[PDB]
């Protein structure tokens, strides 16, 4: 007969490794500019987690762009929280930044994160 | 402070990378295995394989878009491991486990090699 082995922590090991590559600046293929700050990253991971990035890099005219400039209303700390979440599965929230996180998540079109922020606010 | 860990996040990200690969989106390297070409993402290859990690960290090979593997390597075996990289599922037959193991050995996928090693005993 046939056989199969499912490695249950494989995806998590891949994601850790993608983050290690990011932290060392290896194979990063885009810089996200958020006002005065810059975040180096992998297009594939951004696409995987965000509707906005997915749309941006699915566009033929913008596929091979290496710098993406976000709306200047977006705060860098909020984008960093969400970038860290994309690469770690961990969403860090304080009461002092959840509106900023939520607002950023709405702009990036990360609806599951938006909804988690919604539910946190109801449990204040 | 508060923290939320999303336990299926990595699995969702991996599924989405595989969906991108199936549609040939942002694939950036062709792996040649005898007469067969496999399109993939360098980042996923590096994350799963010691050899690809070494190839794509090499200054002389970082910006190459085609990699030719050793011509002894099986295409079916490489395909089984490529599927595993993007899905976490290693499909094995008794007819191809040695090819898979051999290919895993060549790609420096030691945890996969050792998993096959345990089965051959059982």
């Amino acid at each position: 007969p046939d056989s199969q082995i499912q490695f249950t922590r494989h995806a998590s090991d891949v994601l850790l490794n993608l983050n290690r590559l990011r932290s060392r600046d290896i194979l990063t293929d885009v810089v996200i500019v958020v006002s005065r700050e810059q975040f180096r990253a992998h297009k594939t991971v951004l696409m995987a987690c965000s509707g906005l990035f997915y749309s941006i890099f699915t566009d033929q005219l913008k596929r091979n762009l290496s710098v993406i400039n976000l709306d200047p209303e977006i705060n860098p700390e909020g984008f960093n929280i969400l970038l860290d979440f994309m690469y770690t599965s961990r969403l860090n929230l304080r009461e002092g930044n959840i509106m900023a996180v939520m607002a950023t998540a709405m702009y990036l079109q990360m609806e599951h994160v938006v909804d988690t922020c919604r539910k946190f606010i109801k449990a204040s | 402070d508060s923290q939320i860990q999303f336990t299926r996040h990595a699995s969702d990200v991996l599924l989405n990378l595989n969906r991108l690969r199936s549609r040939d989106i942002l694939t950036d390297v062709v792996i040649v295995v005898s007469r067969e070409q496999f399109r993939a993402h360098k980042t996923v290859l590096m994350a799963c394989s010691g050899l690809f990690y070494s190839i794509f960290t090499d200054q002389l090979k970082r910006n190459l878009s085609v990699i030719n593997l050793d011509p002894e390597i099986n295409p079916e075996g490489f395909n089984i491991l490529l599927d595993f990289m993007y899905t976490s599922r290693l499909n094995l037959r008794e007819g191809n486990i040695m090819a898979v193991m051999a290919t895993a050995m060549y790609l420096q996928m030691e945890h996969v090699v050792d998993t096959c090693r345990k089965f051959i005993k059982a």
Binding site: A48, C49, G51, H112, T116 | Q3, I4, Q5, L15, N16
Partner: peptide
């Protein structure tokens, strides 16, 4: 009064086939 939550719900959009 902080907390740590492990949550198994979907976290991100699904890219279609």
């Amino acid at each position: 009064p902080g907390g740590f939550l492990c949550w198994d719900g979907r976290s991100i959009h699904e890219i279609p086939r």
